DNA sequence: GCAGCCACGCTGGCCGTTTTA
DNA sequence: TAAAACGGCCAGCGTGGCTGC
């Protein structure tokens, strides 16, 4: 279902980037600007620099109004298409955030406050039991520290478990800053509002407290004092003794962040 | 259905007066021994830090939603525990049991509120610190006790269940007799006011009557009478009917008149006795204020 | 004296002198429970002890009872159920009696029912009682065997 | 008849009775009102819902209407379902009206769409309608809320879903090769699932006729439907929900926690006047009519009132090609002897300013700016803007300017010169600009300003900042009798009854706002001749600097902004210079 | 060569064991 | 000492192999 929709969007965007990028003539860049971007990346070995207008150029927004709604749905499709290209060749504010904005693209500007340290990540759990073939590598990486997989195919069972291999993996570093809202848009008698933002990967350390920036359109929500909030707090009683309950909050994630302003 | 589940009413006991006891009780908090639990007492004191009234859950309804019955859980303790999926007579002896949940409109509540009573500070020993005590209020008598008053409180003395064997006590109120009857609650007023007017030389007698315990300072009493008057008030500003007269001079005038102003008119405060939070934030009690 | 009070001058009746200081709070304690059964129309009886009251190492019997034998509702009663107050205070020795130059050191003595709130912080009091040591001294799960004084 | 098990209502009597109400309203409230266009409300309002493509209602339409009185108490007792049935039959009325043309606004998609207070409120009122008022304290961030869940699996990864129930979400054991033969473990994605929006806002009331605060739990459509500090009346229904013990287990404590689930908000991110503006603009006596109508409390300081008028029409914000960046800010302080009600004048200025900030003396520090403080709920240190940031655009008001501290009044050099704020500590190293019209007042050393004495001497101000100001005024005491008679007759009339001139209260207020962007006064060549002509005579007094020249050029164009003049004129410059010269002739002593 | 009975394997429910407040 | 969670112990159901018709 989503595999088919994302696969058609994926093939059309792969054809899009494989088509012309910029309409300009020989005076300047002619064509294959994103192809020259990857060759520029081959010169530097870092990432991708994408425009919203260039993605909006080929399908006249048909493909843009496909990605701008559920981007979170289309992350691995966008990575797999770029991966096949590799093997083939080698603005709003905090008030504009709703639940319909999850997965979609929206740009937010603001005021940077309280930079944070550098901490590595994981997303490569290689955890298997006491059985001889202890060389698995869980393809899970979600927002859960569940290293050992249940069903291996050794003589070991699901309860047989051991630690995750911290030596055969690919990690990344990141920081977590909390952006403040501008003081030039807050009304009178109003205190500033806060919002968390996550800076992932290569674009790390670009932050500076006290700056105006433009952000990636994507957005996430992280699983979790929000007890007795009140609100109907869900539980995980599956359909058939007695799990935890939960109450979340809106967060933010990005991959391309320019720091203009 | 149990008859306790369908009540809609309440019952109040009634204390005996001392006149018939004379023919046929003034206790202190120190006199409240922790051995009179279950007995009938009568105390007096000062209402201090009155909490707010919040609803008390009494019985819990449980909708079957499958067999259509109603399960009921009566709770008289502070806490309780959740029950099973259904306790219907038809959900039982069947493979598919129901699934219940509570209900609000079928449950029964009751008025609940508590406060603290401070000692009279006249019956306190010469080298002790006055204690206080918690009194629970329920039902009709709720929202009827202002803090910082003098009242006769009657009740029954019951402990509460919770290092292993420490019994924390309280009092359940039964009758309220308030000393110092609140005003504004005209006949008896003009019964003395019309006589006061026809008394002759009223203006000098009025200002002469406020704090007559000093000698002299007649114009000072005139200023005190005018401070006691006050009382004054489109697309502009109103007028404040407040007077602010300062006093300079020393020394035999010095607190004799200063405490007397709050006597005739009042919280007496000093310099260091009030901090920056005193004359103008605490953890909220039982009921971020 | 509290200075030479430990190890020996132990597990006996000791006469202690000193100053009344830092009086604790007054809490009452339950001893004898009265419970009424509805259908039998009878009363019942149940007691509980702690290490302050028995003076002898007896098996502690702590939960408030209901539905004991047949299914009769053990409605508890009051008034007739007994209670006794409880209090603990500290007494350091007299400061002039101290050695060459030091901060005086102290212990505590627990009172009983008719003697609650007899010492305010700040007086001169002679005390006669019994040196009682309670608690599992670290053999529970690092220095234990905390002390107090009873029979006062 | 249709009936619900727990309630006593029906589908059709409610539907037809609501349709009866939606087809009958003839100003019945005026029939009770006795009247002291008679078409029903819902036809026109349903058309405004219809052609615009765009629920709650008030109370008097159902009281005056005799029918649906039972429907009133049914909604009063069961608001949860009656509103849904009302929207269903309103949708049906939309379809009953749309069959006239059958192509209207794309029928499928439009088809798809205070007696007493809180303290008096008994717990008996479990599910009732409560009319309340008050103010708003703060606003929590957005809380998400799942409406439809999301599930996946492991073998070929089927991803069916189910929705949220009223309290929990269920999930089967096996989904691939359905709920049989236990093939693999079900996956759960709590980010592919649907959500909702909910926000909690705590409110404080103003108990008209101990303090108490209330809260509420608005939803999707009511997100930011309230601001903080507004006088909002609150319509809602009471709730009460249990709480856990020690936030961990299922042992529910007694005394359930209660809240409010609001319905309607009283909050209220029932051009053409320009010709009248030009009529008054064509008046010859505008320079006296506009200034005289500003403050009817004082009948003097006409030059000062004119300067105050020009404070909002101050200069032309001229930035050069490279560098320059010269704003139109002007700052004028007035001072002098008491018994002038100067503070009431300044508060009136604070009232005229749409974003006025009225500060005072000895309550400020450098750290009116840099309001950095600690957070409470998140337990962090959040940097906040100061009072002058609230003055960004407009006029600020400061009292007792002579009584500032060492840090206070020294920060003002940056504002008078760069009109910036320099933040540079460990938290944030970043500057920003915040322009305003600084205006203040103070009192001299001597109770009476004596003559034959320097003005810089009898004022506790630093002389570089003293001449940095635009214009300095002097208020002196007069020994007359005539001004005291008009003073006491004027003030006696203002004091009596507790309250031949045209007094526009709001014409000037919108005139300045209209003239701020639509008026750009130009200062061409013809004025420079008179400028140098006046400037040589100005420079003749010595023993006058370029500071006074910048004062005259920013004050002449300020008057040119007045009376809607996009160019400069050789005239209006004489009194522009003379306004400064009146102060200068006061500097003889 | 096919059906019924017995033996072995798999699935579901209840009781026992462990830790925090 | 009580309550909650997970593992072990006990009970019920299904499939394959062996025996009889």
Curated annotation (Swiss-Prot), chain A:
Domain of life, per lineage: Eukaryota
Modified residues (Phosphoserine): 190
Location relative to the cell: Nucleus
Family recorded in the similarity comment: Belongs to the MCM family.
Function recorded in the entry: Acts as a component of the MCM2-7 complex (MCM complex) which is the putative replicative helicase essential for 'once per cell cycle' DNA replication initiation and elongation in eukaryotic cells. The active ATPase sites in the MCM2-7 ring are formed through the interaction surfaces of two neighboring subunits such that a critical structure of a conserved arginine finger motif is provided in trans relative to the ATP-binding site of the Walker A box of the adjacent subunit. The six ATPase active sites, however, are likely to contribute differentially to the complex helicase activity.
Subunit-structure text: Component of the MCM2-7 complex. The complex forms a toroidal hexameric ring with the proposed subunit order MCM2-MCM6-MCM4-MCM7-MCM3-MCM5; loaded onto DNA, forms a head-head double hexamer. Interacts with MCM10.
Miscellaneous information on this protein: Present with 13400 molecules/cell in log phase SD medium. Early fractionation of eukaryotic MCM proteins yielded a variety of dimeric, trimeric and tetrameric complexes with unclear biological significance. Specifically a MCM467 subcomplex is shown to have in vitro helicase activity which is inhibited by the MCM2 subunit. The MCM2-7 hexamer is the proposed physiological active complex.
Gene behind the chain: MCM6
Curated annotation (Swiss-Prot), chain B:
Domain of life: Eukaryota
Residues where ATP 1 binds: 215, 252, 254-255
Cellular localisation: Cytoplasm; Nucleus
Described purpose of this protein according to its UniProt entry: Acts as a component of the MCM2-7 complex (MCM complex) which is the putative replicative helicase essential for 'once per cell cycle' DNA replication initiation and elongation in eukaryotic cells. Core component of CDC45-MCM-GINS (CMG) helicase, the molecular machine that unwinds template DNA during replication, and around which the replisome is built.
Subunit structure: Component of the MCM2-7 complex. The complex forms a toroidal hexameric ring with the proposed subunit order MCM2-MCM6-MCM4-MCM7-MCM3-MCM5; loaded onto DNA, forms a head-head double hexamer. Interacts with CSM1 and MCM10.
Miscellaneous section: Present with 166 molecules/cell in log phase SD medium. Early fractionation of eukaryotic MCM proteins yielded a variety of dimeric, trimeric and tetrameric complexes with unclear biological significance. Specifically a MCM467 subcomplex is shown to have in vitro helicase activity which is inhibited by the MCM2 subunit. The MCM2-7 hexamer is the proposed physiological active complex.
Family to which this protein belongs: Belongs to the MCM family.
Protein name: DNA replication licensing factor MCM7
Organism: Saccharomyces cerevisiae (strain ATCC 204508 / S288c)
Gene name for this UniProt entry: MCM7
Whole sequence portion shown: 192 to 507 of 845
Swiss-Prot record, chain C:
Taxonomic superkingdom: Eukaryota
Subcellular location: Nucleus
Cystines in this chain: none
UniProt family annotation: Belongs to the MCM family.
Subunit annotation: Component of the MCM2-7 complex. The complex forms a toroidal hexameric ring with the proposed subunit order MCM2-MCM6-MCM4-MCM7-MCM3-MCM5; loaded onto DNA, forms a head-head double hexamer. Interacts with CSM1.
More details: Present with 35100 molecules/cell in log phase SD medium.
Functional description taken from the UniProt entry: Acts as a component of the MCM2-7 complex (MCM complex) which is the putative replicative helicase essential for 'once per cell cycle' DNA replication initiation and elongation in eukaryotic cells. The active ATPase sites in the MCM2-7 ring are formed through the interaction surfaces of two neighboring subunits such that a critical structure of a conserved arginine finger motif is provided in trans relative to the ATP-binding site of the Walker A box of the adjacent subunit. The six ATPase active sites, however, are likely to contribute differentially to the complex helicase activity.
Protein's recorded name: DNA replication licensing factor MCM3
Species whose genome carries this gene: Saccharomyces cerevisiae (strain ATCC 204508 / S288c) (Baker's yeast)
Taxonomic lineage: Eukaryota, Fungi, Dikarya, Ascomycota, Saccharomycotina
UniProtKB/Swiss-Prot annotation, chain D:
UniProt-annotated binding residues for ATP: 336-343
Principal EC category: hydrolase
Known EC number: 3.6.4.12
GO annotation, cellular component aspect: CMG complex; cytoplasm; DNA replication preinitiation complex; MCM complex; MCM core complex; nuclear pre-replicative complex; nuclear replication fork; nucleoplasm
Segments forming domain MCM: 286-492
Catalytic activity: ATP + H2O = ADP + phosphate + H(+)
Quaternary structure and interacting proteins, as annotated: Component of the MCM2-7 complex. The complex forms a toroidal hexameric ring with the proposed subunit order MCM2-MCM6-MCM4-MCM7-MCM3-MCM5; loaded onto DNA, forms a head-head double hexamer.
Lineage of the organism: Eukaryota, Fungi, Dikarya, Ascomycota, Saccharomycotina
Species for this entry: Saccharomyces cerevisiae (strain ATCC 204508 / S288c)
The protein, known as: DNA replication licensing factor MCM4
Additional remarks: Present with 8800 molecules/cell in log phase SD medium. Early fractionation of eukaryotic MCM proteins yielded a variety of dimeric, trimeric and tetrameric complexes with unclear biological significance. Specifically a MCM467 subcomplex is shown to have in vitro helicase activity which is inhibited by the MCM2 subunit. The MCM2-7 hexamer is the proposed physiological active complex.
Phenotype for residue 342 to A: Loss of MCM2-7 complex helicase activity
Principal localisation: nucleus
Designated gene of the protein: MCM4
Residue range from the parent sequence: 177 to 838 of 933
């Amino acid at each position: 279902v989503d595999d088919v929709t994302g696969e058609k969007v994926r093939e059309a965007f792969e054809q899009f980037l494989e088509d012309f990028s910029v309409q300009s003539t020989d005076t300047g860049e002619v064509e294959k600007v994103y192809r020259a971007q990857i060759e520029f990346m081959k010169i530097y070995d870092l990432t991708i620099y994408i425009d919203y207008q260039h993605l909006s150029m080929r399908e006249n927004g048909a493909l843009a109004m496909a990605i701008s709604e559920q981007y979170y749905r289309f992350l691995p499709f966008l990575q797999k298409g770029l991966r096949r290209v590799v093997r083939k060749y080698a603005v709003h504010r905090i008030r504009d955030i709703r639940s319909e904005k999850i997965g979609s693209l929206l740009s937010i500007s603001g005021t940077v406050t309280r930079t944070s340290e550098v901490r590595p990540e994981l997303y490569k759990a290689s955890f298997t039991c006491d059985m001889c073939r202890a060389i698995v590598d869980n393809v899970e990486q979600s927002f859960k520290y569940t290293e050992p997989t249940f069903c291996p195919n050794p003589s070991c069972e699901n309860r047989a478990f051991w630690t995750l291999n911290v030596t055969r993996s690919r990690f990344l570093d990141w920081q977590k800053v909390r952006i403040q809202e501008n003081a030039n848009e807050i009304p009178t008698g109003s205190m500033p509002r806060t919002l968390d933002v996550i800076l992932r990967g290569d674009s790390v350390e670009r932050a500076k407290p006290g700056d105006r920036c433009k952000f990636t359109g994507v957005e996430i929500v992280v699983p979790d004092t929000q007890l007795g909030l009140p609100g109907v707090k869900p539980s995980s009683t599956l359909d058939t003794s007695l799990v935890r309950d939960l109450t979340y909050k809106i967060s933010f994630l990005a991959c391309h962040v320019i720091s203009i302003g | 259905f149990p008859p306790n589940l369908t009540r809609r009413y309440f019952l109040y006991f009634k204390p005996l007066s001392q006149n018939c006891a004379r023919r046929y009780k003034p206790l202190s908090v120190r006199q409240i021994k922790g051995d009179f639990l279950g007995q009938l007492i009568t105390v007096r004191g000062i209402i201090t830090r009155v909490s707010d009234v919040k609803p008390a859950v009494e019985v819990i309804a449980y909708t079957c939603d499958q067999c259509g019955y109603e399960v009921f859980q009566e709770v008289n303790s502070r806490t309780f525990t959740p029950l099973s999926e259904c306790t219907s007579e038809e959900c039982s002896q069947n493979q598919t049991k129901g699934q219940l949940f509570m209900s609000t409109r079928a449950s029964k509540f009751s008025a609940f509120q508590e406060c603290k009573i401070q000692e009279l500070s006249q019956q306190v020993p010469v080298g002790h610190i006055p204690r206080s005590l918690n009194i629970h209020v329920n039902g009709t008598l709720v929202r009827s006790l202002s803090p910082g008053d003098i009242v006769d409180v009657t009740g029954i003395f019951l402990p509460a269940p919770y290092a292993g064997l420490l019994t924390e006590t309280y009092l359940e109120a039964q009758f309220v007799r308030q000393h110092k009857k609140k005003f504004a609650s005209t006949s008896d007023v003009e019964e003395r006011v019309m006589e006061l007017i026809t008394s002759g030389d009223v203006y000098n007698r009025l200002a002469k009557s406020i704090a007559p315990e000093i000698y002299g300072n007649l114009d000072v009493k005139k200023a005190l009478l005018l401070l006691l008057v006050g009382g004054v008030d489109g697309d502009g500003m109103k007028i404040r009917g407040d007077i602010n007269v300062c006093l300079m001079g020393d020394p035999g005038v010095k607190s004799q008149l200063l405490k007397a102003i709050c006597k005739i008119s009042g919280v007496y405060t000093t310099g260091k006795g009030s901090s920056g939070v005193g004359l103008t934030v605490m953890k909220d009690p039982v009921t971020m204020i | 004296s509290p200075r030479t009070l430990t190890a020996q001058h132990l597990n006996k009746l000791v006469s202690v002198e000193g100053i009344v200081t830092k009086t604790s709070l007054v809490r009452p304690k339950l001893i004898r429970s009265v419970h009424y059964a509805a259908k039998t129309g009878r009363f019942h009886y149940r007691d509980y002890t702690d290490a302050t009251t028995t003076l002898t190492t007896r098996i502690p019997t702590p939960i408030y009872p209901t539905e004991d034998t047949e299914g009769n509702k053990l409605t508890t009663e009051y008034g007739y159920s007994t209670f006794i107050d409880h209090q603990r205070i500290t007494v350091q020795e007299m400061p002039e009696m101290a050695p060459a130059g030091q901060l005086p050191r102290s212990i505590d003595v627990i009172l009983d029912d008719d003697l609650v709130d007899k010492t305010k912080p700040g007086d001169r009091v002679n005390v006669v009682g019994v040196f009682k040591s309670l608690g599992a001294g670290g053999m529970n799960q690092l220095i234990g065997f905390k002390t107090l004084i009873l029979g006062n | 008849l249709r009936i619900i098990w727990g309630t006593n209502v029906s589908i059709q009597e409610c539907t037809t009775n609501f349709r009866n109400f939606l087809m009958s309203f003839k100003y019945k409230f005026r029939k009770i009102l006795d009247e002291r266009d008679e078409e029903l409300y819902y036809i026109k309002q349903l058309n405004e819902m219809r052609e615009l493509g765009t629920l709650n209602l008030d109370a008097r339409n159902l009281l005056a209407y005799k029918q649906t009185e039972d429907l009133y108490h049914q909604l009063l007792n069961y608001p949860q379902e009656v509103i849904s049935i009302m929207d269903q039959t309103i949708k049906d009325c939309m379809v009953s009206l749309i069959v006239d043309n059958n192509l209207d606004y794309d029928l499928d998609e439009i088809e798809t769409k205070s007696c007493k207070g809180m303290r008096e409120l008994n717990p008996n009122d479990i599910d009732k309608l409560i009319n309340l008022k008050g103010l708003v304290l703060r606003s929590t961030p957005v809380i998400p809320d799942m409406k439809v869940a999301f599930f996946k699996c492991n073998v070929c990864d089927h991803t069916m879903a189910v929705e949220i129930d009223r309290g929990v979400i269920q999930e089967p054991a096996r989904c691939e090769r359905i709920d049989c033969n236990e093939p693999n473990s079900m996956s759960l994605i709590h980010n592919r699932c649907s959500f909702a929006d909910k926000q909690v806002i705590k409110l404080q009331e103003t108990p008209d006729f101990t303090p108490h605060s209330i809260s509420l739990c608005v939803y999707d459509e009511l997100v930011d439907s309230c601001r903080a500090g507004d006088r909002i009346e609150v319509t809602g229904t009471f709730r009460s929900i249990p709480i856990r013990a020690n936030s961990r287990q299922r042992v529910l404590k007694s005394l359930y926690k209660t809240y409010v689930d609001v319905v309607h908000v009283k909050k209220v991110l029932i051009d053409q006047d320009l010709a009248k503006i030009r009529e008054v603009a064509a008046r010859e006596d505008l320079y006296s009519l506009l200034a005289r109508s500003i403050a009817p409390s004082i009948y003097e300081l006409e030059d000062v009132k004119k300067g105050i008028l020009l404070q909002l029409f101050g200069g032309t914000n001229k930035t050069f090609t490279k560098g320059g960046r010269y704003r139109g800010d002007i700052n004028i302080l007035l001072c002098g002897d008491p018994s002038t009600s100067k503070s009431q004048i300044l508060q009136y200025v604070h009232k005229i300013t749409p974003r006025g900030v009225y500060t005072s003396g000895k309550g400020s520090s450098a750290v009116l700016t840099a309001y950095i403080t600690r957070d409470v709920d998140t337990k962090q240190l959040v940097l906040e803007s100061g009072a002058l940031v609230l003055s960004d655009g407009g006029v600020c008001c400061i009292d007792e300017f002579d009584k500032m501290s060492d840090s206070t009044r020294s920060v003002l050099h940056e504002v008078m010169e760069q009109q910036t704020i320099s933040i540079a500590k460990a938290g944030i190293i970043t500057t920003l600009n915040a322009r305003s019209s600084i205006l203040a007042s103070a009192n001299p050393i001597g109770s009476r300003y004596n003559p034959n004495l320097p003005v810089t001497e009898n004022i506790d101000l630093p002389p570089p900042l003293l001449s940095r100001f635009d214009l300095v005024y002097l208020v002196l005491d007069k020994v007359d009798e005539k001004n005291d008679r008009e003073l006491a007759k004027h003030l006696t009339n203002l004091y009596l009854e507790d309250k031949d001139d045209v007094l526009p209260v709001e014409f000037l207020t919108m005139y300045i706002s209209y003239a701020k962007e639509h008026i750009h006064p130009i200062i061409t060549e013809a004025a420079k001749t008179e400028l140098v002509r006046a400037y040589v005579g100005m420079r003749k007094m010595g023993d006058a600097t370029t500071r006074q020249l910048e004062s005259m050029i920013r004050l002449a164009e300020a008057h040119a902004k007045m009376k809607l003049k996009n160019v400069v004129e050789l005239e209006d410059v004489q009194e522009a210079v003379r306004l400064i010269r009146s102060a200068i002739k006061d500097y003889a002593t």
